């Protein structure tokens, strides 16, 4: 499957829910801005609206799941994925040492709306640590952020 699967749709819904923090079924400029700040970007008002406008098929000013899914499923050009992942690493690696610690991971995840347990943080670190050196580096993060 290059094709859209039920599993993929369910994963995209889980991602949608991370944006739609009030659970009302639509992502507002306020909700999009909050997630972007958690990931280290402070978008302007017009950037948020201009971005929403490009995918806002029904013209209501906010993004519903159908619109989000269409965006995520699309066969695309210039997705900015590699560069966005590179940039996102910076909020994880807050001390700039090139590695994401357990504490660092826990901090970003809390900002994204989690309350992860110690076991989950430790498991997330261990899973990413494919070279087995005890730590999580940039290339390891990249593999997790395309899993």
């Amino acid at each position: 499957a290059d094709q859209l699967t039920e599993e993929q749709i369910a994963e995209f819904k889980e991602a949608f829910s991370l944006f739609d923090k009030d659970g009302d079924g639509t992502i507002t400029t306020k909700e999009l801005g909050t997630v972007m700040r958690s990931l280290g970007q402070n978008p302007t008002e017009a950037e948020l609206q201009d971005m929403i406008n490009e995918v806002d098929a029904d013209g209501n000013g906010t993004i519903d799941f159908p619109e989000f899914l269409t965006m995520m499923a699309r066969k695309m050009k210039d997705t900015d994925s590699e560069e966005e992942i590179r940039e996102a690493f910076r909020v994880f690696d807050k001390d700039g040492n090139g590695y994401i610690s357990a504490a660092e991971l826990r901090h970003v995840m809390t900002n994204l709306g989690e309350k992860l347990t110690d076991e989950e943080v430790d498991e997330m670190i261990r899973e990413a640590d494919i070279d087995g050196d005890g730590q999580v580096n940039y290339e390891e993060f990249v593999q997790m952020m395309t899993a």
């Binding site: 991602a15 490009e54 695309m76 997705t79 900015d80 997330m124």
Partner: peptide, 19 residues
């Protein structure tokens, strides 16, 4: 944990596509 990484990655991907 794997699904949590995937959710995070999909959020970043969504911001890229939106950008």
């Amino acid at each position: 944990a794997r699904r949590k990484w995937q959710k995070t990655g999909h959020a970043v991907r969504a911001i890229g596509r939106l950008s």
